[PDB]
Design a protein around this ligand. Structure first.
Ligand SMILES: [C][C]([C])[C]N([C][C]([O])[C]([C]C1=[C][C]=[C][C]=[C]1)[N]C(=O)O[C]1[C]O[C]2O[C][C][C]12)S(=O)(=O)C1=[C][C]=C([B]([O])=O)[C]=[C]1
Ligand SMILES: [Cl-]
Ligand SMILES: [Cl-]
Lengths: 99, 99
């Protein structure tokens, strides 16, 4: 698809058997999801933006379906105010910014 | 251009006659720039990011060039970790997300 930016580029994702709404975010290096359970090993991480840092759990090799496209990569889980799909997964679905 | 996302989508901007580096950020409603001098009166705004809220100064109708594309619009000035070009100006330069 071609997604205009008049409003927030929100899409439905499937992660860990759950449906969530998430923001397609070219300004995010990594994908950050609100608190949920994911299988496998994890390690703690601090990530920072406007307003400072939050502590998250880093899960690797997680499969996500993003607007119908499957991708695998790292997902950070923690107290983010919005679910964010970052570049680490946007690349896998072939997303580009065009102007 | 067509910008892939394997690296951060950084561009050069020109604001107040000076060149700066900024991130093309589809996850940002607003454009937020590090502390600098801008003309005219400003208005208060509170914006919420991943780590909480910060106060910024809102300047309207500011002339700004983004990767060579001319825009005129609202610029927020404050303690952002990086200069971010948000959807208010990404729409002015005709940017879409594509996959
Ligand atoms: C600031 C950017 C450089 C990095 N962020 C990504 C942005 O797209 C962020 C995404 C976002 C959106 C809503 C609420 C909270 C955050 N938007 C953002 O702050 O917008 C502000 C300006 O306009 C307003 O509209 C939206 C909020 C206001 S981040 O979330 O901090 C981040 C940092 C590190 C990592 B990591 O993987 O290390 C991943 C993500
Ligand atoms: Cl990854
Ligand atoms: Cl104020």
């Amino acid at each position: 698809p071609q997604i205009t930016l008049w409003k927030r580029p929100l899409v439905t994702i499937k992660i860990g058997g759950q449906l969530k709404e998430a923001l397609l975010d070219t300004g995010a290096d990594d994908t950050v999801i609100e608190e949920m359970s994911l299988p496998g090993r994890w390690k703690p991480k601090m990530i920072g933006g406007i307003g400072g840092f939050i502590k998250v759990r880093q899960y690797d090799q997680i499969i996500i379906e993003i607007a119908g496209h499957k991708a695998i990569g790292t997902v950070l889980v923690g107290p983010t105010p919005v679910n964010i799909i970052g570049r680490n997964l946007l690349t896998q679905i072939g997303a580009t910014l065009n102007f």
